[PDB]
mmCIF file of C-alpha atoms in Angstrom:
data_model
loop_
_atom_site.group_PDB
_atom_site.id
_atom_site.type_symbol
_atom_site.label_atom_id
_atom_site.label_comp_id
_atom_site.label_asym_id
_atom_site.label_seq_id
_atom_site.Cartn_x
_atom_site.Cartn_y
_atom_site.Cartn_z
ATOM 1 C CA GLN A 1 42.325 14.365 -85.836
ATOM 2 C CA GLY A 2 42.843 13.827 -82.167
ATOM 3 C CA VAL A 3 42.055 11.693 -79.138
ATOM 4 C CA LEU A 4 38.500 10.852 -77.628
ATOM 5 C CA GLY A 5 38.285 10.076 -73.956
ATOM 6 C CA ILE A 6 35.705 7.470 -73.045
ATOM 7 C CA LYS A 7 34.177 7.024 -69.471
ATOM 8 C CA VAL A 8 31.801 4.230 -68.864
ATOM 9 C CA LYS A 9 29.801 3.931 -65.516
ATOM 10 C CA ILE A 10 27.506 1.088 -64.521
ATOM 11 C CA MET A 11 25.544 0.599 -61.407
ATOM 12 C CA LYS A 12 24.957 -3.164 -60.880
ATOM 13 C CA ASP A 13 21.970 -4.559 -59.425
ATOM 14 C CA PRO A 14 22.584 -4.496 -55.544
ATOM 15 C CA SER A 15 20.458 -7.582 -54.890
ATOM 16 C CA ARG A 16 22.646 -9.542 -57.315
ATOM 17 C CA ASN A 17 25.978 -7.983 -55.853
ATOM 18 C CA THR A 18 27.347 -10.988 -54.047
ATOM 19 C CA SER A 19 30.266 -10.619 -51.426
ATOM 20 C CA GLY A 20 28.908 -7.584 -49.770
ATOM 21 C CA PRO A 21 25.542 -5.800 -48.877
ATOM 22 C CA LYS A 22 22.638 -6.539 -51.085
ATOM 23 C CA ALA A 23 21.000 -3.138 -50.973
ATOM 24 C CA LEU A 24 21.697 0.585 -50.730
ATOM 25 C CA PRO A 25 22.354 2.107 -47.386
ATOM 26 C CA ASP A 26 18.964 3.903 -47.329
ATOM 27 C CA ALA A 27 17.030 0.951 -48.807
ATOM 28 C CA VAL A 28 14.509 -0.297 -46.151
ATOM 29 C CA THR A 29 12.443 -3.471 -46.552
ATOM 30 C CA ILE A 30 9.517 -4.128 -44.411
ATOM 31 C CA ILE A 31 8.135 -7.580 -43.918
ATOM 32 C CA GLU A 32 4.478 -7.933 -44.406
ATOM 33 C CA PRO A 33 2.608 -9.168 -41.209
ATOM 34 C CA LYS A 34 0.923 -12.402 -41.060
ATOM 35 C CA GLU A 35 -2.902 -12.438 -40.727
ATOM 36 C CA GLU A 36 -4.497 -14.549 -37.868
ATOM 37 C CA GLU A 37 -7.726 -15.144 -36.333
ATOM 38 C CA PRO A 38 -8.340 -14.180 -32.622
ATOM 39 C CA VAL A 39 -11.857 -15.626 -31.724
ATOM 40 C CA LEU A 40 -10.711 -18.786 -29.857
ATOM 41 C CA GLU A 41 -11.538 -17.546 -26.303
ATOM 42 C CA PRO A 42 -11.316 -20.709 -24.125
ATOM 43 C CA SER A 43 -9.250 -22.909 -26.180
ATOM 44 C CA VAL A 44 -7.446 -25.227 -23.579
ATOM 45 C CA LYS A 45 -6.030 -27.655 -26.027
ATOM 46 C CA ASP A 46 -4.716 -30.347 -23.783
ATOM 47 C CA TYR A 47 -1.640 -32.449 -24.899
ATOM 48 C CA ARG A 48 -0.799 -35.896 -23.494
ATOM 49 C CA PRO A 49 1.276 -35.487 -20.216
ATOM 50 C CA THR A 50 4.622 -36.871 -20.139
ATOM 51 C CA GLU A 51 6.837 -37.891 -17.053
ATOM 52 C CA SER B 1 -15.110 -8.280 4.582
ATOM 53 C CA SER B 2 -11.268 -8.103 5.039
ATOM 54 C CA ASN B 3 -11.099 -4.229 5.282
ATOM 55 C CA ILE B 4 -7.346 -4.358 4.381
ATOM 56 C CA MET B 5 -5.562 -1.181 3.437
ATOM 57 C CA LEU B 6 -2.069 -0.958 2.159
ATOM 58 C CA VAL B 7 0.041 2.284 2.504
ATOM 59 C CA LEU B 8 3.360 3.267 0.866
ATOM 60 C CA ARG B 9 5.924 2.936 3.761
ATOM 61 C CA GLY B 10 9.241 3.468 1.980
ATOM 62 C CA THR B 11 11.070 4.324 -1.297
ATOM 63 C CA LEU B 12 14.129 2.377 -2.292
ATOM 64 C CA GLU B 13 16.105 4.716 -4.367
ATOM 65 C CA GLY B 14 19.466 3.859 -5.791
ATOM 66 C CA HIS B 15 18.817 2.357 -9.096
ATOM 67 C CA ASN B 16 19.309 4.352 -12.378
ATOM 68 C CA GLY B 17 17.079 2.275 -14.938
ATOM 69 C CA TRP B 18 13.504 1.023 -14.850
ATOM 70 C CA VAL B 19 13.386 -1.814 -12.172
ATOM 71 C CA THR B 20 12.457 -4.482 -14.418
ATOM 72 C CA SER B 21 12.086 -7.399 -12.060
ATOM 73 C CA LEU B 22 12.204 -8.195 -8.428
ATOM 74 C CA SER B 23 12.602 -11.485 -6.359
ATOM 75 C CA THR B 24 12.519 -12.515 -2.751
ATOM 76 C CA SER B 25 13.450 -15.776 -0.903
ATOM 77 C CA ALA B 26 11.169 -17.413 1.521
ATOM 78 C CA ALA B 27 14.220 -18.518 3.892
ATOM 79 C CA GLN B 28 15.638 -14.925 4.003
ATOM 80 C CA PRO B 29 12.851 -12.413 4.594
ATOM 81 C CA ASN B 30 15.021 -9.065 4.720
ATOM 82 C CA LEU B 31 16.710 -9.531 1.380
ATOM 83 C CA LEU B 32 15.389 -8.216 -1.985
ATOM 84 C CA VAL B 33 17.506 -8.468 -5.190
ATOM 85 C CA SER B 34 16.421 -6.083 -8.059
ATOM 86 C CA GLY B 35 17.653 -5.663 -11.493
ATOM 87 C CA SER B 36 17.145 -2.493 -13.624
ATOM 88 C CA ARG B 37 17.804 -0.873 -16.981
ATOM 89 C CA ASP B 38 21.182 0.259 -15.614
ATOM 90 C CA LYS B 39 22.690 -3.243 -16.381
ATOM 91 C CA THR B 40 23.076 -3.956 -12.725
ATOM 92 C CA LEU B 41 21.545 -5.760 -9.862
ATOM 93 C CA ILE B 42 21.199 -4.367 -6.468
ATOM 94 C CA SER B 43 20.860 -6.352 -3.324
ATOM 95 C CA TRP B 44 18.565 -4.536 -0.540
ATOM 96 C CA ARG B 45 18.691 -5.197 3.219
ATOM 97 C CA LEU B 46 15.386 -4.203 4.566
ATOM 98 C CA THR B 47 15.332 -1.919 7.868
ATOM 99 C CA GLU B 48 12.271 -1.472 9.941
ATOM 100 C CA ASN B 49 13.410 1.919 11.526
ATOM 101 C CA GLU B 50 12.257 4.899 9.653
ATOM 102 C CA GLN B 51 11.293 6.240 6.180
ATOM 103 C CA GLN B 52 13.446 4.183 3.837
ATOM 104 C CA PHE B 53 12.369 0.525 3.989
ATOM 105 C CA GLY B 54 15.399 -0.950 2.931
ATOM 106 C CA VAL B 55 19.196 -0.533 2.369
ATOM 107 C CA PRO B 56 21.313 -1.454 -0.753
ATOM 108 C CA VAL B 57 24.004 -3.887 -0.006
ATOM 109 C CA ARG B 58 25.780 -4.953 -3.119
ATOM 110 C CA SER B 59 25.640 -3.809 -6.978
ATOM 111 C CA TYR B 60 26.264 -6.573 -9.388
ATOM 112 C CA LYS B 61 28.035 -5.151 -12.392
ATOM 113 C CA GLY B 62 29.031 -7.433 -15.402
ATOM 114 C CA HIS B 63 26.067 -7.200 -17.619
ATOM 115 C CA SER B 64 26.558 -5.343 -20.845
ATOM 116 C CA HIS B 65 22.917 -4.536 -21.585
ATOM 117 C CA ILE B 66 19.495 -4.231 -20.045
ATOM 118 C CA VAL B 67 18.822 -6.546 -17.079
ATOM 119 C CA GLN B 68 15.319 -7.920 -17.667
ATOM 120 C CA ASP B 69 14.377 -10.718 -15.233
ATOM 121 C CA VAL B 70 16.035 -11.462 -11.849
ATOM 122 C CA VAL B 71 15.588 -14.570 -9.764
ATOM 123 C CA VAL B 72 17.068 -15.520 -6.480
ATOM 124 C CA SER B 73 17.780 -19.114 -5.344
ATOM 125 C CA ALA B 74 15.819 -21.099 -2.883
ATOM 126 C CA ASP B 75 18.239 -20.920 -0.081
ATOM 127 C CA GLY B 76 18.621 -17.184 -0.627
ATOM 128 C CA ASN B 77 22.380 -17.177 -1.258
ATOM 129 C CA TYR B 78 22.549 -17.104 -5.124
ATOM 130 C CA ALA B 79 20.854 -15.023 -7.638
ATOM 131 C CA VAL B 80 20.407 -15.654 -11.424
ATOM 132 C CA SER B 81 20.292 -12.616 -13.666
ATOM 133 C CA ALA B 82 18.902 -12.549 -17.232
ATOM 134 C CA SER B 83 20.082 -9.678 -19.311
ATOM 135 C CA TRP B 84 19.829 -8.261 -22.890
ATOM 136 C CA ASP B 85 23.348 -9.306 -23.752
ATOM 137 C CA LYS B 86 22.167 -12.954 -24.717
ATOM 138 C CA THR B 87 23.823 -14.250 -21.536
ATOM 139 C CA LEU B 88 22.769 -15.268 -17.943
ATOM 140 C CA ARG B 89 24.808 -14.483 -14.749
ATOM 141 C CA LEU B 90 24.837 -16.396 -11.522
ATOM 142 C CA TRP B 91 25.888 -14.437 -8.620
ATOM 143 C CA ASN B 92 26.908 -15.088 -4.971
ATOM 144 C CA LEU B 93 24.642 -12.925 -2.956
ATOM 145 C CA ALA B 94 27.544 -12.405 -0.325
ATOM 146 C CA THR B 95 30.680 -12.409 -2.361
ATOM 147 C CA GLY B 96 29.224 -10.172 -5.103
ATOM 148 C CA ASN B 97 31.292 -12.027 -7.945
ATOM 149 C CA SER B 98 29.712 -13.998 -10.675
ATOM 150 C CA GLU B 99 30.029 -17.796 -10.530
ATOM 151 C CA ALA B 100 28.635 -18.895 -13.921
ATOM 152 C CA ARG B 101 28.097 -17.249 -17.307
ATOM 153 C CA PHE B 102 25.457 -19.099 -19.268
ATOM 154 C CA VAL B 103 25.931 -18.579 -23.084
ATOM 155 C CA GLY B 104 24.044 -19.995 -26.087
ATOM 156 C CA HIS B 105 21.063 -17.856 -26.606
ATOM 157 C CA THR B 106 21.093 -16.147 -30.087
ATOM 158 C CA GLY B 107 18.579 -13.551 -28.785
ATOM 159 C CA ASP B 108 18.660 -11.392 -25.734
ATOM 160 C CA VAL B 109 17.182 -13.244 -22.790
ATOM 161 C CA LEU B 110 13.867 -12.009 -21.458
ATOM 162 C CA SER B 111 13.145 -14.302 -18.481
ATOM 163 C CA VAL B 112 14.953 -17.017 -16.277
ATOM 164 C CA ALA B 113 13.399 -19.437 -13.812
ATOM 165 C CA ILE B 114 15.043 -21.320 -10.801
ATOM 166 C CA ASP B 115 14.122 -24.934 -10.197
ATOM 167 C CA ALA B 116 12.201 -25.891 -7.051
ATOM 168 C CA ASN B 117 15.280 -27.581 -6.014
ATOM 169 C CA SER B 118 18.891 -26.238 -6.794
ATOM 170 C CA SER B 119 19.173 -28.426 -9.964
ATOM 171 C CA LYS B 120 18.076 -26.711 -13.117
ATOM 172 C CA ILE B 121 17.875 -23.050 -14.645
ATOM 173 C CA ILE B 122 15.051 -22.341 -17.036
ATOM 174 C CA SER B 123 15.588 -19.353 -19.356
ATOM 175 C CA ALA B 124 13.455 -17.758 -22.075
ATOM 176 C CA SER B 125 15.003 -15.626 -24.811
ATOM 177 C CA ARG B 126 13.936 -13.639 -27.999
ATOM 178 C CA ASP B 127 15.339 -16.580 -30.177
ATOM 179 C CA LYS B 128 11.977 -18.188 -29.849
ATOM 180 C CA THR B 129 13.641 -20.863 -27.788
ATOM 181 C CA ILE B 130 13.807 -21.897 -24.049
ATOM 182 C CA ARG B 131 17.100 -23.256 -22.514
ATOM 183 C CA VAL B 132 17.600 -25.693 -19.632
ATOM 184 C CA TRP B 133 20.998 -25.261 -17.992
ATOM 185 C CA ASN B 134 22.844 -26.938 -15.069
ATOM 186 C CA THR B 135 24.204 -24.779 -12.178
ATOM 187 C CA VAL B 136 27.633 -25.269 -13.601
ATOM 188 C CA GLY B 137 26.807 -23.104 -16.716
ATOM 189 C CA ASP B 138 26.229 -25.557 -19.675
ATOM 190 C CA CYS B 139 22.911 -25.915 -21.488
ATOM 191 C CA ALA B 140 21.294 -29.267 -21.077
ATOM 192 C CA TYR B 141 18.086 -28.889 -23.013
ATOM 193 C CA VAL B 142 16.987 -26.580 -25.914
ATOM 194 C CA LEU B 143 13.145 -26.603 -25.813
ATOM 195 C CA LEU B 144 11.425 -25.440 -28.916
ATOM 196 C CA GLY B 145 7.637 -25.131 -29.785
ATOM 197 C CA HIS B 146 7.331 -21.308 -29.684
ATOM 198 C CA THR B 147 7.208 -19.448 -33.137
ATOM 199 C CA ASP B 148 7.925 -16.108 -31.626
ATOM 200 C CA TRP B 149 9.600 -14.404 -28.651
ATOM 201 C CA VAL B 150 8.962 -16.066 -25.273
ATOM 202 C CA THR B 151 8.684 -13.237 -22.675
ATOM 203 C CA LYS B 152 8.100 -15.097 -19.328
ATOM 204 C CA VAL B 153 8.811 -18.366 -17.629
ATOM 205 C CA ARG B 154 8.315 -19.042 -14.025
ATOM 206 C CA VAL B 155 7.923 -22.375 -12.341
ATOM 207 C CA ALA B 156 4.771 -23.889 -10.895
ATOM 208 C CA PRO B 157 5.709 -24.869 -7.363
ATOM 209 C CA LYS B 158 5.155 -28.430 -6.449
ATOM 210 C CA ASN B 159 2.934 -28.387 -3.399
ATOM 211 C CA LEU B 160 1.588 -31.861 -2.558
ATOM 212 C CA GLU B 161 1.754 -33.899 -5.872
ATOM 213 C CA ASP B 162 2.074 -37.550 -5.327
ATOM 214 C CA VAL B 163 4.120 -37.474 -2.148
ATOM 215 C CA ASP B 164 6.897 -36.824 -4.781
ATOM 216 C CA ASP B 165 7.237 -37.140 -8.704
ATOM 217 C CA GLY B 166 10.713 -35.829 -9.359
ATOM 218 C CA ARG B 167 8.944 -33.893 -12.190
ATOM 219 C CA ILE B 168 9.505 -30.206 -12.880
ATOM 220 C CA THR B 169 6.487 -28.326 -14.198
ATOM 221 C CA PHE B 170 6.477 -24.707 -15.474
ATOM 222 C CA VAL B 171 4.711 -22.478 -17.988
ATOM 223 C CA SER B 172 6.028 -20.305 -20.582
ATOM 224 C CA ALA B 173 4.539 -17.483 -22.806
ATOM 225 C CA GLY B 174 5.261 -14.605 -25.093
ATOM 226 C CA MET B 175 4.396 -13.021 -28.584
ATOM 227 C CA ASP B 176 3.078 -16.294 -29.754
ATOM 228 C CA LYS B 177 -0.367 -15.375 -28.101
ATOM 229 C CA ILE B 178 -0.256 -18.751 -26.287
ATOM 230 C CA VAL B 179 0.617 -20.238 -22.886
ATOM 231 C CA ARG B 180 2.570 -23.578 -22.799
ATOM 232 C CA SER B 181 3.087 -26.045 -19.983
ATOM 233 C CA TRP B 182 6.296 -28.020 -19.763
ATOM 234 C CA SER B 183 7.460 -30.993 -17.711
ATOM 235 C CA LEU B 184 10.991 -31.867 -16.857
ATOM 236 C CA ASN B 185 13.113 -34.794 -15.427
ATOM 237 C CA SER B 186 11.845 -36.399 -20.005
ATOM 238 C CA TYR B 187 11.958 -32.629 -20.307
ATOM 239 C CA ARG B 188 9.088 -32.603 -22.860
ATOM 240 C CA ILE B 189 5.643 -30.848 -23.614
ATOM 241 C CA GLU B 190 2.414 -30.676 -21.686
ATOM 242 C CA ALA B 191 -0.970 -29.031 -22.227
ATOM 243 C CA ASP B 192 -1.695 -25.662 -23.888
ATOM 244 C CA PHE B 193 -3.582 -22.539 -23.050
ATOM 245 C CA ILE B 194 -5.017 -20.260 -25.773
ATOM 246 C CA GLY B 195 -7.008 -17.411 -24.477
ATOM 247 C CA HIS B 196 -5.266 -14.212 -25.332
ATOM 248 C CA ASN B 197 -6.288 -11.787 -28.099
ATOM 249 C CA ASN B 198 -3.138 -9.850 -28.041
ATOM 250 C CA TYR B 199 0.349 -11.285 -27.009
ATOM 251 C CA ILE B 200 1.091 -12.381 -23.560
ATOM 252 C CA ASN B 201 3.435 -10.033 -21.664
ATOM 253 C CA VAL B 202 3.766 -11.929 -18.355
ATOM 254 C CA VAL B 203 2.544 -15.175 -16.694
ATOM 255 C CA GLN B 204 2.779 -16.306 -13.140
ATOM 256 C CA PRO B 205 1.821 -19.651 -11.357
ATOM 257 C CA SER B 206 0.088 -19.326 -7.964
ATOM 258 C CA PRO B 207 2.204 -19.922 -4.840
ATOM 259 C CA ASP B 208 0.697 -23.200 -4.262
ATOM 260 C CA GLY B 209 1.184 -24.030 -7.858
ATOM 261 C CA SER B 210 -2.350 -24.988 -9.176
ATOM 262 C CA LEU B 211 -3.355 -21.497 -10.600
ATOM 263 C CA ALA B 212 -1.611 -19.817 -13.528
ATOM 264 C CA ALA B 213 -2.183 -16.138 -14.180
ATOM 265 C CA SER B 214 -1.493 -14.613 -17.603
ATOM 266 C CA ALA B 215 -1.743 -11.203 -18.980
ATOM 267 C CA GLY B 216 -1.194 -9.293 -22.138
ATOM 268 C CA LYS B 217 -1.349 -6.135 -24.087
ATOM 269 C CA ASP B 218 -5.194 -5.801 -24.080
ATOM 270 C CA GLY B 219 -5.344 -6.037 -20.310
ATOM 271 C CA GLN B 220 -7.150 -9.321 -20.399
ATOM 272 C CA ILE B 221 -6.073 -11.131 -17.336
ATOM 273 C CA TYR B 222 -6.799 -14.857 -17.575
ATOM 274 C CA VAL B 223 -6.558 -17.336 -14.649
ATOM 275 C CA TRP B 224 -6.218 -21.179 -15.526
ATOM 276 C CA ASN B 225 -5.805 -24.452 -13.732
ATOM 277 C CA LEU B 226 -2.596 -26.366 -14.634
ATOM 278 C CA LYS B 227 -3.434 -29.608 -12.779
ATOM 279 C CA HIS B 228 -6.998 -29.422 -14.112
ATOM 280 C CA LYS B 229 -6.046 -28.021 -17.434
ATOM 281 C CA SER B 230 -9.102 -25.597 -17.702
ATOM 282 C CA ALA B 231 -9.816 -21.931 -17.372
ATOM 283 C CA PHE B 232 -10.332 -20.613 -13.941
ATOM 284 C CA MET B 233 -11.636 -17.031 -14.592
ATOM 285 C CA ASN B 234 -11.073 -13.771 -16.777
ATOM 286 C CA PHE B 235 -10.937 -10.227 -16.117
ATOM 287 C CA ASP B 236 -10.113 -7.147 -18.097
ATOM 288 C CA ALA B 237 -7.574 -4.370 -16.996
ATOM 289 C CA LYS B 238 -8.546 -1.884 -19.751
ATOM 290 C CA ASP B 239 -4.918 -0.643 -19.629
ATOM 291 C CA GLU B 240 -1.408 -1.990 -20.249
ATOM 292 C CA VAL B 241 -0.762 -4.707 -17.615
ATOM 293 C CA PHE B 242 2.965 -4.867 -17.574
ATOM 294 C CA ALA B 243 3.461 -7.313 -14.705
ATOM 295 C CA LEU B 244 1.420 -9.253 -12.118
ATOM 296 C CA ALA B 245 1.880 -11.351 -9.042
ATOM 297 C CA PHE B 246 -0.007 -13.770 -6.678
ATOM 298 C CA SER B 247 0.151 -13.123 -2.901
ATOM 299 C CA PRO B 248 1.298 -15.815 -0.480
ATOM 300 C CA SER B 249 -1.000 -15.102 2.399
ATOM 301 C CA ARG B 250 -4.152 -13.556 0.660
ATOM 302 C CA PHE B 251 -5.916 -14.785 -2.371
ATOM 303 C CA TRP B 252 -4.991 -11.868 -4.420
ATOM 304 C CA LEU B 253 -3.514 -10.747 -7.899
ATOM 305 C CA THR B 254 -1.511 -7.633 -8.067
ATOM 306 C CA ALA B 255 -1.608 -6.199 -11.563
ATOM 307 C CA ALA B 256 0.808 -3.407 -12.950
ATOM 308 C CA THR B 257 -1.505 -1.603 -15.284
ATOM 309 C CA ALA B 258 -0.129 1.454 -17.393
ATOM 310 C CA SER B 259 -2.173 3.794 -15.161
ATOM 311 C CA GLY B 260 -1.492 2.349 -11.766
ATOM 312 C CA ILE B 261 -1.427 -0.948 -9.885
ATOM 313 C CA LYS B 262 -4.784 -2.771 -9.293
ATOM 314 C CA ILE B 263 -5.338 -5.630 -6.899
ATOM 315 C CA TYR B 264 -7.835 -8.344 -7.726
ATOM 316 C CA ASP B 265 -9.493 -10.349 -4.779
ATOM 317 C CA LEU B 266 -9.756 -13.789 -6.283
ATOM 318 C CA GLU B 267 -12.494 -15.184 -4.183
ATOM 319 C CA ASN B 268 -14.832 -12.315 -4.804
ATOM 320 C CA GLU B 269 -13.862 -11.793 -8.319
ATOM 321 C CA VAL B 270 -13.745 -8.060 -7.775
ATOM 322 C CA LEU B 271 -10.891 -5.638 -7.491
ATOM 323 C CA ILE B 272 -10.527 -4.015 -3.983
ATOM 324 C CA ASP B 273 -7.765 -1.501 -4.063
ATOM 325 C CA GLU B 274 -5.875 0.855 -6.644
ATOM 326 C CA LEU B 275 -2.262 2.126 -5.998
ATOM 327 C CA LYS B 276 -1.265 5.339 -7.720
ATOM 328 C CA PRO B 277 1.503 7.144 -6.158
ATOM 329 C CA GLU B 278 1.822 11.063 -6.112
ATOM 330 C CA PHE B 279 4.436 12.479 -8.515
ATOM 331 C CA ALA B 280 5.114 16.179 -9.257
ATOM 332 C CA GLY B 281 5.558 18.300 -12.372
ATOM 333 C CA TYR B 282 4.186 15.838 -14.870
ATOM 334 C CA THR B 283 1.256 16.147 -17.382
ATOM 335 C CA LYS B 284 -0.813 13.047 -16.318
ATOM 336 C CA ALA B 285 -0.141 11.227 -19.607
ATOM 337 C CA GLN B 286 3.334 9.815 -18.850
ATOM 338 C CA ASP B 287 3.172 9.194 -15.175
ATOM 339 C CA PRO B 288 5.648 6.300 -14.339
ATOM 340 C CA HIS B 289 3.867 2.961 -14.391
ATOM 341 C CA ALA B 290 5.012 -0.236 -12.728
ATOM 342 C CA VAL B 291 7.113 -2.954 -14.428
ATOM 343 C CA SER B 292 8.134 -5.010 -11.510
ATOM 344 C CA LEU B 293 5.829 -6.403 -8.710
ATOM 345 C CA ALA B 294 6.951 -8.688 -5.795
ATOM 346 C CA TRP B 295 5.172 -9.673 -2.573
ATOM 347 C CA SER B 296 7.022 -10.432 0.640
ATOM 348 C CA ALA B 297 7.479 -13.916 1.877
ATOM 349 C CA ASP B 298 4.598 -13.751 4.494
ATOM 350 C CA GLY B 299 2.440 -11.491 2.350
ATOM 351 C CA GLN B 300 2.828 -8.278 4.365
ATOM 352 C CA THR B 301 4.777 -6.020 2.065
ATOM 353 C CA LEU B 302 4.600 -5.248 -1.779
ATOM 354 C CA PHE B 303 7.623 -4.102 -3.777
ATOM 355 C CA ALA B 304 6.871 -2.257 -7.038
ATOM 356 C CA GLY B 305 9.679 -1.264 -9.371
ATOM 357 C CA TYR B 306 8.449 1.633 -11.687
ATOM 358 C CA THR B 307 9.993 3.370 -14.661
ATOM 359 C CA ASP B 308 11.184 6.434 -12.794
ATOM 360 C CA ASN B 309 14.159 4.299 -11.410
ATOM 361 C CA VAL B 310 12.535 3.793 -8.063
ATOM 362 C CA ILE B 311 11.330 0.907 -5.890
ATOM 363 C CA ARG B 312 8.191 1.808 -3.860
ATOM 364 C CA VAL B 313 7.073 -0.501 -1.064
ATOM 365 C CA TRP B 314 3.527 -0.586 0.177
ATOM 366 C CA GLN B 315 3.055 -2.257 3.571
ATOM 367 C CA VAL B 316 -0.154 -3.777 4.406
ATOM 368 C CA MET B 317 -1.582 -1.516 7.302
ATOM 369 C CA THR B 318 -5.158 -2.806 8.049
ATOM 370 C CA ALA B 319 -6.835 0.486 9.395
ATOM 371 C CA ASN B 320 -9.798 -1.772 11.060
#
């Protein structure tokens, strides 16, 4: 009875989109900081001197 | 004892960024090379005539980004500039042209150090590495060991070590919250120093070369022995100590706190004087603090480079 028009759109996974940027322009990733211990006050750890 | 007063005698205007670093040569007492955020070095000739203590001589353009640390040579005729464009520049203090362009740091360089002699250039950069160069421009050594940015590296002067050793000892520190000692000929590690709660902003060996003074974010200033490898003392500044400097004549530590400039008398373990210039039209919460400190060769004048694009000199005027 006529013609049907088909439009298909797929937004791929940006992380898997090789050969280009790997995220959206406004996608911001923040690295989680590492946790450390501060209590060691004097801590003069001498190494073997070299000359 | 030692009722010593220091009074601001001149202001060295002419820069356009924060005067990040200062340097002075022992041989030439009337020359002062200062680098600022305006990507330029300025050489100042000091005049003892009236209000202004100095006179700019030459501006050293050629740096694309922030100029962080400045070091003059021992003879007083050459100056090495570290900038935020990942490059180092060697300048003739009279010609005004650059001699060598040290390249190789993947992060912008934060500090540079001159050898005791005119042999080696020591540079610290944000790429967690230290680089040892010749005077020609090539990089001889790539010292690793720091897991974070290295903010400051200034050499421990050999005073009377046995006679002579031909060994070059210096210190390094940064956002690794550690202070490291290095020895060069070969060109390997030395003892460690771990005292800082926060990260180190600046370190500085004493003029003799046996005391190392380190400072950080928490204002916890530490003084250590290098030849003895032990702590010497510890103070708190309770503000942001941006830079610090020993003094040649007196046994003193100038510290550039976020509020003003403290001076610590080391033999008495007590601060003696506080330096806060008088500005106008501010709100007392953003007064321009100090980022560069440098004493004179004799120990009579102090140069402080602030964040208002100004060098201010405090001359020691003992009012009995």
